[PDB]
Design an enzyme around this catalytic site. Structure first.
Site, short mmCIF file in Angstrom:
data_model
loop_
_atom_site.label_atom_id
_atom_site.label_comp_id
_atom_site.label_asym_id
_atom_site.label_seq_id
_atom_site.Cartn_x
_atom_site.Cartn_y
_atom_site.Cartn_z
N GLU A 35 7.08 -10.41 15.84
CA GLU A 35 7.84 -11.49 15.26
C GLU A 35 9.23 -11.62 15.86
O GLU A 35 9.63 -12.73 16.23
CB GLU A 35 7.93 -11.44 13.74
CG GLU A 35 6.61 -11.65 13.00
CD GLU A 35 6.16 -13.10 13.02
OE1 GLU A 35 6.85 -13.94 13.58
OE2 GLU A 35 5.06 -13.22 12.42
N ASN A 46 11.37 -24.55 13.58
CA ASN A 46 10.04 -25.16 13.68
C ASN A 46 10.27 -26.69 13.61
O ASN A 46 10.34 -27.23 12.48
CB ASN A 46 9.11 -24.64 12.60
CG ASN A 46 9.03 -23.12 12.64
OD1 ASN A 46 8.56 -22.54 13.65
ND2 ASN A 46 9.53 -22.50 11.58
N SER A 51 11.36 -26.37 9.13
CA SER A 51 11.70 -25.06 8.44
C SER A 51 12.24 -24.16 9.55
O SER A 51 12.10 -24.50 10.73
CB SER A 51 10.43 -24.50 7.81
OG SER A 51 9.49 -24.18 8.86
N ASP A 53 12.51 -19.81 10.60
CA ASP A 53 12.06 -18.41 10.45
C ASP A 53 13.31 -17.52 10.72
O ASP A 53 13.97 -17.68 11.75
CB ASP A 53 10.99 -18.06 11.46
CG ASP A 53 9.73 -18.93 11.26
OD1 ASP A 53 9.39 -19.19 10.13
OD2 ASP A 53 9.17 -19.22 12.34
N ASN A 60 10.03 -17.34 6.55
CA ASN A 60 10.17 -18.81 6.48
C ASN A 60 10.90 -19.39 5.30
O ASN A 60 10.64 -19.07 4.13
CB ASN A 60 8.79 -19.45 6.72
CG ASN A 60 8.92 -20.95 7.07
OD1 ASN A 60 8.72 -21.76 6.18
ND2 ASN A 60 9.17 -21.23 8.34
#
Length: 130
Positions: A35, A46, A51, A53, A60
């Site tokens: 990640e 995103n 949204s 991360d 999120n």
């Protein structure tokens, strides 16, 4: 901060992640590796759904933390997303625990399925003394 592998493994163990809701430490390590590369300040926007991360576990903003700019979002961890960019990972760990308490568990992260599910994950904790 960018953690070294064994330093993170020891940190997560102390924070009680080993076996949390049935998830072994090596799985959590595999997740952080793919990640964020063990980077607490990583952020990924995103464009597709507006949204973001955040942090080591790329949590999120649509469901887990509040960043104010994500439409129709909730804040299940009850935290500002800013909290997930600190060098101190205690808040990020508490939130990750909240994420896996939901039915999907660790599967909530697609990276986990692609990169960690059904693989030999021992590599991530080998020689760390955990």
């Amino acid at each position: 901060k960018v953690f070294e592998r064994c330093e993170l493994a020891r940190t997560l163990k102390r924070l009680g992640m080993d076996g949390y809701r049935g998830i072994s430490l090596a799985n959590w390590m595999c997740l952080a590796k793919w990640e964020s590369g063990y980077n607490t300040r990583a952020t990924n926007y995103n464009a597709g759904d507006r949204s973001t991360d955040y942090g080591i576990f790329q949590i999120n903003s649509r469901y887990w933390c509040n960043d104010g700019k994500t439409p129709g979002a909730v804040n299940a961890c009850h935290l500002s997303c800013s909290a997930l960019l600190q060098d101190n990972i205690a808040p990020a760990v508490a939130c990750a625990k909240r994420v896996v308490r939901d039915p999907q568990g660790i599967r909530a992260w697609v990276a986990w399925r692609n990169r960690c599910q059904n693989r030999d994950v021992r590599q991530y904790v080998q020689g760390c003394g955990v």
